[PDB]
Design an enzyme around this catalytic site. Sequence first.
Site, PDB file in Angstrom:
ATOM      1  N   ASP A  63     -24.468  -8.696   6.263  1.00 22.52           N
ATOM      2  CA  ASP A  63     -23.083  -8.501   6.691  1.00 22.52           C
ATOM      3  C   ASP A  63     -22.931  -7.122   7.302  1.00 22.52           C
ATOM      4  O   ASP A  63     -22.387  -6.203   6.668  1.00 22.52           O
ATOM      5  CB  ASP A  63     -22.140  -8.660   5.498  1.00 22.52           C
ATOM      6  CG  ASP A  63     -20.682  -8.803   5.912  1.00 22.52           C
ATOM      7  OD1 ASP A  63     -20.403  -9.008   7.115  1.00 22.52           O
ATOM      8  OD2 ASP A  63     -19.816  -8.716   5.016  1.00 22.52           O
ATOM      9  N   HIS A 103     -18.355  -9.868   9.161  1.00 21.07           N
ATOM     10  CA  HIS A 103     -17.211 -10.775   9.036  1.00 21.07           C
ATOM     11  C   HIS A 103     -15.946 -10.207   9.674  1.00 21.07           C
ATOM     12  O   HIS A 103     -14.947 -10.903   9.753  1.00 21.07           O
ATOM     13  CB  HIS A 103     -16.949 -11.247   7.582  1.00 21.07           C
ATOM     14  CG  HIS A 103     -16.468 -10.174   6.661  1.00 21.07           C
ATOM     15  ND1 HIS A 103     -17.323  -9.417   5.893  1.00 21.07           N
ATOM     16  CD2 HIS A 103     -15.223  -9.723   6.394  1.00 21.07           C
ATOM     17  CE1 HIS A 103     -16.632  -8.528   5.192  1.00 21.07           C
ATOM     18  NE2 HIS A 103     -15.350  -8.694   5.481  1.00 21.07           N
ATOM     19  N   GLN A 123      -8.618  -6.598   0.124  1.00 27.24           N
ATOM     20  CA  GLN A 123      -8.355  -7.069   1.491  1.00 27.24           C
ATOM     21  C   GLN A 123      -7.830  -5.984   2.421  1.00 27.24           C
ATOM     22  O   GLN A 123      -6.844  -5.324   2.121  1.00 27.24           O
ATOM     23  CB  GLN A 123      -7.427  -8.286   1.493  1.00 27.24           C
ATOM     24  CG  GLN A 123      -8.152  -9.618   1.278  1.00 27.24           C
ATOM     25  CD  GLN A 123      -8.733  -9.741  -0.134  1.00 27.24           C
ATOM     26  OE1 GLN A 123      -8.161  -9.236  -1.086  1.00 27.24           O
ATOM     27  NE2 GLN A 123      -9.879 -10.394  -0.262  1.00 27.24           N
ATOM     28  N   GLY A 124      -8.536  -5.777   3.531  1.00 25.08           N
ATOM     29  CA  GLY A 124      -8.171  -4.746   4.483  1.00 25.08           C
ATOM     30  C   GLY A 124      -9.154  -3.576   4.455  1.00 25.08           C
ATOM     31  O   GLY A 124      -9.113  -2.694   5.338  1.00 25.08           O
ATOM     32  N   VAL A 172       2.143   5.309  12.099  1.00 23.32           N
ATOM     33  CA  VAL A 172       2.867   6.305  12.861  1.00 23.32           C
ATOM     34  C   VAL A 172       1.920   7.128  13.700  1.00 23.32           C
ATOM     35  O   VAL A 172       0.890   7.556  13.208  1.00 23.32           O
ATOM     36  CB  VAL A 172       3.629   7.255  11.904  1.00 23.32           C
ATOM     37  CG1 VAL A 172       4.256   8.411  12.665  1.00 23.32           C
ATOM     38  CG2 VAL A 172       4.683   6.484  11.128  1.00 23.32           C
ATOM     39  N   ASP A 210     -11.200  -0.714  -7.265  1.00 23.60           N
ATOM     40  CA  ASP A 210     -12.030  -1.578  -6.428  1.00 23.60           C
ATOM     41  C   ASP A 210     -11.538  -1.590  -4.964  1.00 23.60           C
ATOM     42  O   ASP A 210     -10.523  -0.962  -4.633  1.00 23.60           O
ATOM     43  CB  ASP A 210     -11.936  -2.991  -7.014  1.00 23.60           C
ATOM     44  CG  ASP A 210     -13.024  -3.921  -6.535  1.00 23.60           C
ATOM     45  OD1 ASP A 210     -13.933  -3.484  -5.807  1.00 23.60           O
ATOM     46  OD2 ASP A 210     -12.964  -5.121  -6.884  1.00 23.60           O
ATOM     47  N   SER A 211     -12.321  -2.200  -4.081  1.00 21.33           N
ATOM     48  CA  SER A 211     -11.937  -2.342  -2.686  1.00 21.33           C
ATOM     49  C   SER A 211     -11.153  -3.654  -2.655  1.00 21.33           C
ATOM     50  O   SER A 211     -11.271  -4.462  -3.577  1.00 21.33           O
ATOM     51  CB  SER A 211     -13.177  -2.394  -1.791  1.00 21.33           C
ATOM     52  OG  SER A 211     -14.138  -3.290  -2.299  1.00 21.33           O
ATOM     53  N   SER A 253     -12.638  -4.118   4.143  1.00 23.23           N
ATOM     54  CA  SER A 253     -13.900  -4.578   4.735  1.00 23.23           C
ATOM     55  C   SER A 253     -14.388  -3.745   5.905  1.00 23.23           C
ATOM     56  O   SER A 253     -13.586  -3.304   6.716  1.00 23.23           O
ATOM     57  CB  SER A 253     -13.773  -6.005   5.204  1.00 23.23           C
ATOM     58  OG  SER A 253     -14.147  -6.919   4.191  1.00 23.23           O
ATOM     59  N   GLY A 254     -15.695  -3.491   5.960  1.00 27.36           N
ATOM     60  CA  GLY A 254     -16.272  -2.718   7.049  1.00 27.36           C
ATOM     61  C   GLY A 254     -16.214  -1.226   6.854  1.00 27.36           C
ATOM     62  O   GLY A 254     -16.851  -0.472   7.577  1.00 27.36           O
ATOM     63  N   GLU A 301      -7.164   8.713  12.403  1.00 31.37           N
ATOM     64  CA  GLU A 301      -5.979   8.152  11.760  1.00 31.37           C
ATOM     65  C   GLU A 301      -5.795   8.576  10.317  1.00 31.37           C
ATOM     66  O   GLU A 301      -6.760   8.829   9.602  1.00 31.37           O
ATOM     67  CB  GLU A 301      -6.058   6.611  11.725  1.00 31.37           C
ATOM     68  CG  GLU A 301      -5.930   5.870  13.070  1.00 31.37           C
ATOM     69  CD  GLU A 301      -4.485   5.665  13.487  1.00 31.37           C
ATOM     70  OE1 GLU A 301      -3.645   6.440  13.011  1.00 31.37           O
ATOM     71  OE2 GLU A 301      -4.184   4.737  14.273  1.00 31.37           O
ATOM     72  N   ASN A 329      -1.931   8.074   8.766  1.00 29.46           N
ATOM     73  CA  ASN A 329      -0.870   7.086   8.599  1.00 29.46           C
ATOM     74  C   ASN A 329      -1.088   6.101   9.744  1.00 29.46           C
ATOM     75  O   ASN A 329      -0.833   6.437  10.897  1.00 29.46           O
ATOM     76  CB  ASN A 329       0.501   7.740   8.740  1.00 29.46           C
ATOM     77  CG  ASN A 329       1.644   6.758   8.534  1.00 29.46           C
ATOM     78  OD1 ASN A 329       1.553   5.580   8.882  1.00 29.46           O
ATOM     79  ND2 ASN A 329       2.729   7.245   7.959  1.00 29.46           N
TER      80      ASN A 329
HETATM   81 CA   LIG Z   1      -1.475   7.399  13.044  1.00 23.97          CA
END
Ligand SMILES: [Ca+2]
Lengths: 222, 56
Positions: free
Chosen positions: A84, A40, A173-174, A57, A170-171, A176-177, A52, A54
């Site tokens: 999925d 999805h 929005q953002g 930045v 919990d997990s 996913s994957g 990554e 932050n």
């Molecule tokens: Ca960064």
Amino acid sequence: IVGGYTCGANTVPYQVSLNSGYHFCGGSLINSQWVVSAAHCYKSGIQVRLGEDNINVVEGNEQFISASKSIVHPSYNSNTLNNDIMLIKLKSAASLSRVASISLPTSCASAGTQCLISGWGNTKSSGTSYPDVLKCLKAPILSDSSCKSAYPGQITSNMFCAGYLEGGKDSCQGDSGGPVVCSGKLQGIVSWGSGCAQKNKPGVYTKVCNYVSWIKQTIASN
Amino acid sequence: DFCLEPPYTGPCTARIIRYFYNAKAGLCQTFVYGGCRAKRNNFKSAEDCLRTCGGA
Ligand SMILES: [Ca+2]
């Protein structure tokens, strides 16, 4: 990730951010040139960001590499959310301590197994609060029966629940994957749930151990 | 009228920015879509949104 903690800079080396002008999903690096995420999260013009911490930045340990191919599982069902899973090929190979791949599982994990879930998703159950740094959460895999009791007629053989029935962790929005790593192996892909961190509504994840063959063969023929 | 329906994030946990027609404001606004089970008041751009729902 609701109810989690700050992982620490580059302590989850296999975690990637999928960016389309902004972070929209997570993913896991399985080798120098391939990333696994949720179906999805399929989007055109994906740029994968490695190393990554932050996400807002530029800290100097990043590698931004565009995807050259995005392969969604041939049997992904957008209505039931079954299968999925998606593989993303990097346009060029990443340079692998801050950026590293995660191992695929040899077998499925059992209920009660403690796993590490990570992501840059919303940290509030009621409300919105997107973090700058990567958040982490230790949650146990739940039994197929309780999972099925929480989501009647929605859980397939390719999904597993993880979390706490009390809610609060919990997990969201953002996320996913992103990865669900247990004993150093990639066991799940953050997928869906009912709201975030609600009581009796744990998160549902894609059961990676059922796709290992498909993954290995798909990577090799693309 | 689907243009009058409130925005639907859905069960999936992506953070995809989409547009929905806000009849109260008389304009298309952004909202977070989870990635699956979209309802009809969900557009990829403000232009699509206005073309379909504008003036509802
Ligand atoms: Ca960064």
